[PDB]
């Protein structure tokens, strides 16, 4: 028989194909909306600074909410407290990197381990490149390279993150589920900095590489990835 | 049925079209293009008729066999590879053969062949080289050119013509083709003063001159 079963097979196939097409359109429109939002955010600071200058006052921009941290010292001879903080920040290997959202706890935690890390405020392009090139997902306690959107969609579907654009937007804007997104994100393994470092041991202010560099972390990332 | 129209968008960049999805939906006029829903042969025998089965089963299977291969897409046979040519090489340019039996002989270049090899010849009347093929990598292209846009070379010569056979005897067809090409090439190079002697000479490196310094 199966005169109906055979057509039902392809009916199910067509339904699945239409569902996939709808999902693709959804993520495409969401990416377009994210691009619009990024442009709006970029122009808003310029507008506010311009109006403040025109009025003669000053416009202090909001303190950055997202930071990128790279471990720049080895495993040998580490104080136990610094070792514990590095373990908590998930920097167990030299030239590992991760994103950290900022608050009092994060500030003090980073201050404890200033000599061992170089951290700064990542740029949108830096986030994009880091996610696309070095970004691997932690699925089933396994380091899986993110080569398809379904891998992201399963691990973060309940948080309405369904593709690379959602992941990047949520990381860059520090969304409500930034903790879940960042934890799903495996720590980045960056190559050695092409062109060399200035001086690993000392602080960035005194001509070294350790400590906080506000926006030079983007210059560092460009050569470390 | 239906004559195959050309693509409606010029290639902006490789893999990216000039017009978007909606512009294409308009240009294709798809708003009015909606659509909706062997192995046996009978033969006579002198008995009766026999249903002979072509594609019969093999009479020997090997002890063991290798499995199939996984499928790959970007790999194409050498026949349909895209052919590249250096910018400095144009018809009528002087080349310096670097690796053949004709080491360092200045030779006039005529045409790019189908498999990528250069069809080259300096009239063997003066520098002693016939119609020949040469890989574009193994030649130095100097910046001296003659005008051969107004010469005709036979269409019958090709890679199948120049393919090696099997003592090698030159054929009368080879001789007549060489004469036909050189009878037009030679007057062109004789117009330029001191060019025949230049082609007769042989390139060489003496002490104190270095290729990265000297220009050609």
């Amino acid at each position: 028989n199966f005169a109906e079963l055979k057509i039902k097979r392809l009916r199910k196939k067509f339904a699945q194909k239409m569902l996939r097409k709808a999902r693709r359109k959804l993520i495409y429109e969401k990416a377009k909306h994210y691009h619009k939002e990024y442009r709006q955010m970029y122009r808003t600071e310029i507008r506010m600074a311009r109006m403040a200058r025109k009025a003669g006052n000053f416009y202090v921009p909001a303190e950055p909410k997202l930071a990128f941290v790279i471990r720049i010292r080895g495993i040998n001879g580490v104080s136990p407290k610094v070792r514990k903080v590095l373990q908590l920040l998930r920097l167990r290997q030299i030239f590992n990197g991760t994103f950290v959202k900022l608050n009092k706890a994060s500030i003090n935690m980073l201050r404890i381990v200033e000599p061992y890390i170089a951290w700064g405020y990542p740029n949108l392009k830096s986030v994009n490149e880091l996610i696309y090139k070095r970004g691997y997902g932690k699925i089933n306690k396994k380091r899986i390279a993110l080569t398809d959107n379904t891998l992201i969609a399963r691990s973060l579907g309940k948080y309405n993150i369904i593709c690379m654009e959602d992941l990047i937007h949520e990381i860059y804007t520090v969304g409500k589920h930034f903790k879940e997104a960042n934890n799903f994100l495996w720590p980045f393994k960056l190559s050695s900095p092409r062109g060399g470092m200035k001086k690993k041991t000392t602080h960035f202010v005194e001509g070294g590489d350790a400590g906080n560099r506000e926006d030079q972390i983007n210059r560092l990332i460009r050569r470390m990835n | 049925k239906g004559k195959p129209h050309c693509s409606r968008n010029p290639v902006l960049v490789r893999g990216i079209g000039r017009y978007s999805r909606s512009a294409m939906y308009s240009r294709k006029a798809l708003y009015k293009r909606k659509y909706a829903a062997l192995a046996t042969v009978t033969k006579p025998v002198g008995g009766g008729t026999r249903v002979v089965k072509l594609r019969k089963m093999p009479r020997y299977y090997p002890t063991e066999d290798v499995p199939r291969k996984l499928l790959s897409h970007g790999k194409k046979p050498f026949s349909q590879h895209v052919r590249k040519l250096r910018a400095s090489i144009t018809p009528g340019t002087i080349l310096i053969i670097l690796t053949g039996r004709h080491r360092g002989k200045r030779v006039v270049f005529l045409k790019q062949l189908s498999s990528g090899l250069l069809l080259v010849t300096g009239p063997l009347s003066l520098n002693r080289v016939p119609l020949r093929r040469t890989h574009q990598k193994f030649v130095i292209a100097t910046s001296t050119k003659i005008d051969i846009s107004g010469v005709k070379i036979p269409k019958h010569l090709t890679d199948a013509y120049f393919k090696k056979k099997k003592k090698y005897e030159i054929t009368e067809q080879r001789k007549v083709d060489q004469k036909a090409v050189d009878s037009q090439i030679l007057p062109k190079i004789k117009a330029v003063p001191q060019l025949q002697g230049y082609l007769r000479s042989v390139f060489a490196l003496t002490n104190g001159v270095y290729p990265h310094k000297l220009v050609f």
Partner: peptide, 19 residues
């Protein structure tokens, strides 16, 4: 529409409309 459950009828609608 992209929701597998509530978007089934809308998906059917657009699929039939394409015809």
């Amino acid at each position: 529409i992209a929701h597998p459950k509530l978007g089934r009828r809308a998906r059917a609608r657009i699929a039939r409309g394409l015809r």
